Amino acid sequence: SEFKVTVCFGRTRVVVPCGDGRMKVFSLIQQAVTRYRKAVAKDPNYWIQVHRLEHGDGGILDLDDILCDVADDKDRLVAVFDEQ
Amino acid sequence: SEFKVTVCFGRTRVVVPCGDGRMKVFSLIQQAVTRYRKAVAKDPNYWIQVHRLEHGDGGILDLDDILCDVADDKDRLVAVFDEQ
Amino acid sequence: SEFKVTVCFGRTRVVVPCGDGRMKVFSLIQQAVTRYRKAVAKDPNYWIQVHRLEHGDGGILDLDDILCDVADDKDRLVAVFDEQ
Amino acid sequence: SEFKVTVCFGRTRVVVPCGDGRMKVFSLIQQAVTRYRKAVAKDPNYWIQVHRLEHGDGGILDLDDILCDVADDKDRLVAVFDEQ
Amino acid sequence: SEFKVTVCFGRTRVVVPCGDGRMKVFSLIQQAVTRYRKAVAKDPNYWIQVHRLEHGDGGILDLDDILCDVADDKDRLVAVFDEQ
Amino acid sequence: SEFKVTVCFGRTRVVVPCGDGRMKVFSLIQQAVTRYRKAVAKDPNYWIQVHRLEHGDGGILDLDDILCDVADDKDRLVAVFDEQ
Amino acid sequence: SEFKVTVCFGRTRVVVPCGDGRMKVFSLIQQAVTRYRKAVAKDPNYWIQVHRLEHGDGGILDLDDILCDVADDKDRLVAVFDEQ
Amino acid sequence: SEFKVTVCFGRTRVVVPCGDGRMKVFSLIQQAVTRYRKAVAKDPNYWIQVHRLEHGDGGILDLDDILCDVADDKDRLVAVFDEQ
Amino acid sequence: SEFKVTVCFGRTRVVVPCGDGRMKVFSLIQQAVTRYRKAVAKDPNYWIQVHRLEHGDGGILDLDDILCDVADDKDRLVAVFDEQ
Amino acid sequence: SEFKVTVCFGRTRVVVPCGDGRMKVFSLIQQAVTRYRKAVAKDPNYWIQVHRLEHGDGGILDLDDILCDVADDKDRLVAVFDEQ
Amino acid sequence: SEFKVTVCFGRTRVVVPCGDGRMKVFSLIQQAVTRYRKAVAKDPNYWIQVHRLEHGDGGILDLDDILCDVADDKDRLVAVFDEQ
Amino acid sequence: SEFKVTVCFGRTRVVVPCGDGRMKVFSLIQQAVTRYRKAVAKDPNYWIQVHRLEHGDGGILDLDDILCDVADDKDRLVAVFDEQ
Amino acid sequence: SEFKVTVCFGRTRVVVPCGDGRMKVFSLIQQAVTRYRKAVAKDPNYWIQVHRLEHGDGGILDLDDILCDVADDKDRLVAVFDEQ
Amino acid sequence: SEFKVTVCFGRTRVVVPCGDGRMKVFSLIQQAVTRYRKAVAKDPNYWIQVHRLEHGDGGILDLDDILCDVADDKDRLVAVFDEQ
Amino acid sequence: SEFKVTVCFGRTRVVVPCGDGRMKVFSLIQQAVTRYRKAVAKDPNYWIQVHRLEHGDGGILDLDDILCDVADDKDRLVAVFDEQ
Amino acid sequence: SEFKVTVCFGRTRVVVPCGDGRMKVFSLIQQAVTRYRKAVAKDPNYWIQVHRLEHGDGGILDLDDILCDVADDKDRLVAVFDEQ
Amino acid sequence: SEFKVTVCFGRTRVVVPCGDGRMKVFSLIQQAVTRYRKAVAKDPNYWIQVHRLEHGDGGILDLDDILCDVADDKDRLVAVFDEQ
Amino acid sequence: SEFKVTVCFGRTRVVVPCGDGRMKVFSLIQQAVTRYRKAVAKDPNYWIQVHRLEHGDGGILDLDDILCDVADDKDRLVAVFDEQ
Amino acid sequence: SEFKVTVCFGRTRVVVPCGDGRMKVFSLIQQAVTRYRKAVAKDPNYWIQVHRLEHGDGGILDLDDILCDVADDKDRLVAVFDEQ
Asked: Searching chain C, which residue's CA lies closest to the CA of residue D31?
C-alpha cells in the first residue's frame, strides 16, 4: 500500500514491508522473521521467540494491536528476542 | 484513532495506545495497568494503586480530566505508584 | 479547548488545565487551588491566600487580567502564597 | 492583543500587559505605575516621576514614541525613577 | 514514467532510471549492473553477485518485492556486492 | 517601520528609532542629536559636531550613504564628537 | 517548451536551454558544447570529449536516455570532460 | 503584457519591463541599456558592451535565444559589462 | 477600479489609491504627492522632486511607463526624493 | 450588504459593520465612533478627533475616498486619535 | 545590495560599502581610497598605491578577481600600501 | 562558485580562488603558481616544481584527485617545492 | 563521497581519500599502500605487509570490518608494518 | 550501527565494534575475545575466562545487562581475566 | 533509561545501573547490594545493613528521597555499612 | 525540581534537598533539622536553635530571604547553632 | 534578580542580597546596615555613619553611583565606619 | 557600560568608574580628580596638576589618547602630581 | 586596534600605543620618539638616532620588519640610542 516500518533484529535491521499496516502485531513479526531468515539462514534450525518491539528509549509496545493505529510509520523499532 | 501517549511505570515504560484520547483519566490507567501486567506478570497478585502521572519536572496532572484536552500527545509521563 | 498553563505551588507544581484561557485571573487560581488540595489535602482546614504568579525572574503579573492575553501558553509560573 | 513588555521598577519587575502596543510612551508608564502601586501600595502618597526606560546596557529609549515601532516585544526594560 | 532511484555500487553511485518502479527487485539490479558496466567496463569478465541494497544505517531491504511499494523514491541505497 | 539602530554619544547611548532606515546618514544624526538633547539638555547652547560613527573596533562608516544598505540593523555604533 | 537544465563545464556553468527535454542525451551535450564554445572560444581547435553528467554527490547518469524521464528539471549537473 | 525581468547593471539594478518576453535577447539588452542611461547618464559618451546575463551562481545564459522560453520570469539576472 | 499600490515617502508610507492603474507614471506621483501633503503639510512651500520608485532591493523602475503593465499590484515601493 | 471592516480604536478594536462600503471615509468613522462610545461611554463628554486609519506597517490611507475602492475588505486598520 | 566588507588602511580601518560585490577588485580599492581620503585628507596630494589585501595571517588575495566569489563577506582585510 | 582553499608557498601564503573545486589537483597548482608569480615575479625565469600539499602535521594529500572530494574547504595547506 | 581518513605509514602520514567508506578494511590498505608508494617509491621492490591500524593509545581495530561503521571519520590511525 | 566501545585485554586494548550496543553483556565479550584471538593467537589452546569490565577507578559493571543502557559509548573499559 | 550512578561498597565500587532514577532510595540500595553479592558472594550468609550514601566530603544524603531529584547523575557516592 | 544546597550541622554536613529553592529561609532550616535528627537522633529531646548559615569566610546570610535569589546553588554553608 | 555583593562591616561580613544591583549606592548601605543590626543589635541606639566601601587594597569606590556599573559582582568590599 | 580603571592618587587610590572608556585622556583625569576631592576635600583650594599615569614599572602612557585602545581594563595606574 | 608594546628610552620607558601593529618598524620609532619628546622636551633641539630595540638579554630585532609578525605583544623592548 503506502505504509512501511523497521524492526531491529540484532545487528541487521530488517526493513519490513508493511503494506497497508492493517493487521494485528503477529503477521509482521512473521514477515520479518522470514526476512531475518532470508538474510542469513544456513539450515533452518534455530528458535524464533521474539519477545517485543521497542522505540529507542521508548517502552514496550503492546504486542497484539493493530500496529498502524498505535504505532505510526517509518519508524525504527528494535526487536528483543532469543532465536539462537 | 490517531492519538497515543506514554506512561512510565518504573523501569519499563509502557507505551499506551490511546485511540482517540476521548476519555476521563481512568480507563487509560487501566489499559496501561493491563499492559504492565502484560509485560511481566507472573501470577496475578499484587496491588495497583498508581498515584499520578507527571511530566519530567512538570507537576501533577489532575487525575480525572479528559486527558486529551489537558494533556497533549505523544508525551512521556511517568507513573508514581505502589503496585508491589 | 487548546490552552493550558503551570502554577508552581511550592514543591508540587500543579499543572493547570486552562481550557481556552478566556477568564480573568481568579477562577484559575481557584482551579489550581482545588488541585493543590486534590494533591495532598488531609482535612480541609488551612488558608488559601495566594499572593501572585511569577515568571522565573520575571516580575509580577497583574493578577486580574484576561490571562491569555497577557500571559502566553504552556508556561511555568510559580505561586507565592501563605496557605498553611 | 498579542504584544507585551517588561518594565523594571526597582526590585520588582513589573510585567506590563501592553495589548497591541499601539500607543505613545505615556499610557504604559501609567499602567505599570498603576501596577507598581497594585503590587505594594500602602496609603497612596508617594511620587511617580519615572525618568526613562532602558535596555541592559542599551541606552535611553526616547520616551514618547510609538513604543511598538521602536521597541520590539517581550523585552525587559528597567525603569529609573524617583517615586519615594 | 516519473519514478527513479539510486544504487551505490562502491565509489561510483549509479543513478538508476527506474521508469515507473513497477517491477520485482531483479530487473533493476540488472539495469544498474548494466550501468556499472557502462561506467567503467574494460573487457567483460568479472562477477556480478550483488548481495543487497541498504539505506544508510537502514537495514536490509528484502530483495524481491515490488520495489516501489516498499521502497519509496529518489532514495540513495548502497549496494553490497562482490563483482571483482 | 521595522528598522532601528544605536548611536553611542559618550556615556549615554542613545537608542535611535530609525523607522525604515531609508535615508542618507544625515537625518539620523539629527534625530539622535535631538535625543541627546532630550536626554540631558539644560539651556540649548552647546556645539553639535559629531565626526563619525564606528563599530567597536570596526572602522569608520562613510558618513553619507543610505545607512540601511551599508550598515545592518540593531547595531551599536559609537559617536565621536565635540558637542561641549 | 517549458523544460530547462544546467551543465557545469568547469568554472563556467552553462545554462542549457532544453526546450521540451524530449531527446536522448546526445543533442544536449552538443548544445551546451556549442554554448561552451560560444562562451569563450578563440579559434576552434580543441577537443570535446565530455565523459558524463553528475549530481553533486549523486552518481553517474546514464548517458543516453531520454533525459527528461530520468533526470528531472532545473537541475545543476556538472560535466566531467577533457576538451583542452 | 504580463512578463517582466531584472538585469543587474552594477550597483543599480534595473528593472526591465519585458512586455510579453517574446523577443530574442537583443532588444532587451537595448531597453535596459536605455534604462541605465535613463538612470544616471550625464552626456552620452561611454561604451555599452555588455557581455552576458547571469543567475546568482547560475551560469551563462545563452545570449540570443527567445528569452522567455529559456529564462523564466521575475528573475534577477546580473549584467557583466564594460560601459565606462 | 480594483488596482492599488504603495509609495514610501520617507517615514510615512503613503498608500496610493490607483484606481485601475491605467496611466503613465506621472499622475500617480502627483496623487501621492498630494497625499503626502495631505498627511502633514503646514504651509505649502517646499519642493517636490521625487527621483524614482524602488522595490526593496529591487532596482529602479522606469519612471514613465504604464505602471500596471510593468509593476504588478499591492506592492510597497519606496520613494527617493528631495522635497524639503 | 456583504462588505465589513475593522477599526482599531486603542485596546478595543471595533468591528465595523460597513454594509456595502459605498461611502466616502466619513460616515464610517462616525459609525465606529458611535460604536466606541457604545462600548464603554460613561457620560458623553470627551473629544473625537481621530486622525487616520492605518494598515499594520502600511501607510496612511487617504481619509476621504470611497473606502471600498481603495481599501479592500475584512481588514484590520487601526485608528490614531485623541478622544480623551 | 546586501554585501559589505572591511579594508584596513593603517590605523583607520575603513568600512567599505560594497553593494552587491559584483565587481573585479579595482573599483573597491577606489571606493575605499576615496573613503580614506574622506576620512582625513587635508590637501589632495599624496600617493595611492595600495599593494594588496590580506586576511589576518591569511595570504595574498589575488587582486583582480570578482571579489565576492573568492572573498566571502563581512570580513576584515588589511591593506598594505604606500600612500604617503 | 562557492568553494576556496589556501596553498602556503613559503612565506607568502597564497589564497587560491577555487571556484567550485571540481577539478583534478593539477589546474590549481597552476593557478596558485600563477599567483605566486603574480605576487613577486621579477623576470620569469625560475623553476616551478612543487612537490605536494600538506595539512599542518597532516600527511601528504594525493596529488591528482578531485580535490573537493578529498580535501574539504577553506583549509590552509602548505606547499613543498623547489622553484628557485 | 564525503568520508575520509588518515593512515600513518611511519614518518609520512598518508592522507587517505576514502570516498564513502563503504568497504571492508582491505581496499583502503591498498589505496594507501599505493599512496605510500606514490609518495617515495624508487623501483618497486619492497614488501607490503602492514599488520594493523591503531588509535593513539587506542587498541587494535579489527582489520576486516566495514571501516565506516566501526571507525568514525577524519581520524588519524597509524600503521604498523614491515614494508622494507 | 553508530555505537562502539573499548575493552582492555592486558597490553593490547581491543577496540570493539559494537554495532548498535543492543545486546546483553555476553556476545561482546565473545566478539572481543575473538578479536583478542585474532590479534595474537598461535594455536587455539588457552582459557578465556574473563571476569569483569571496569572503568579506570570506576567499579565493576554488572556483567549481564544491556550494555548500552548502563554503559555509555566510546569508553575505555579494561578486562580482568585469566586466559593463559 | 539514560540515568546511572556509583555506590562505593568498600574496596569495590559498584557501578549501579539506575535506569531512569525514578525511585525512592530503597530499590537502588537493593540493586547494588545484589551487585555486591554478584561480585564476590561465596555462600549467602552475611548482613546487609548499609547505613548511608555520601559525597566525598559531602554529607549525608537523606536516604529515602527520589534520588534523581536530589542527587544528580554519574556521581560517585560511597556506602557506609556493616555487611560482614 | 533542580535546585539543591548544603548545610553544615557540625561534623555531619547535611545535604539538603531543596527542590526548587522557592521558599523563605525557614522551611529549609526545618528540613535539614529534620535531617539532622534523621541522621543521629536517639530520643527526641534536645534544642534546635540554629543561629545562621555561612559561607567559608563569607559572612552572615540574611536569614529570611528567598534563599535561591540570594544564595546560589550547590553550595556548602555551615550552620552555627546550639541544639544540645 | 541574579546580582549579589559583600560588605565587610568589621568582624562580621555581611552578605548583601542586591537583587538586580540597579540602584545608586545608598539603598544598599541601608540594607546592609539593617542586616548588621539584624545580626547583633541589642537595643537600637548606636550611630551608622559608614564612610566608604573598599576593595582589598583597591581604593575608594565612589559612593553614589549605580553600583552595578562600576562595581562588578560577587565581590567582597569592606566597610569603614563609625557606628558605635 | 562595562569598562573601569584605577588611578593611584597618592595614598588613596581612586577607583575610577570609566563607563565605556570611549574618551580621550582628559575627562577621566577630571572624574578622578573630582573623586579625589570627593574623598577628602576640606575647602576647595588646592592645585590639580596631575602630570601622568603609570603602570608599576611600566612607563608613561601618553596622556591624550583614547584610553581604552591603549590602555586595557581593570588596571591599577598611579598618578604623579602636584595638587597641594 | 588591540595591539600595544613598550620601548625603553633610557630611564623613562615609553609605552607605545601600537594600534593594530600592522606597520614596518619605522613609524613606531617615530611615535615613541614623539612620545619621548612629549615626556620631557624643553626646546626641540637634540638628535634622534635610535639604533635598535632589544629584549632583556634577547638580541637585536631586525629593524624594518612588520613588527607584529616578528615581535609579539605587550612586550618590553629597550631602546639603544644617541639623542642628546
From this structure: C62
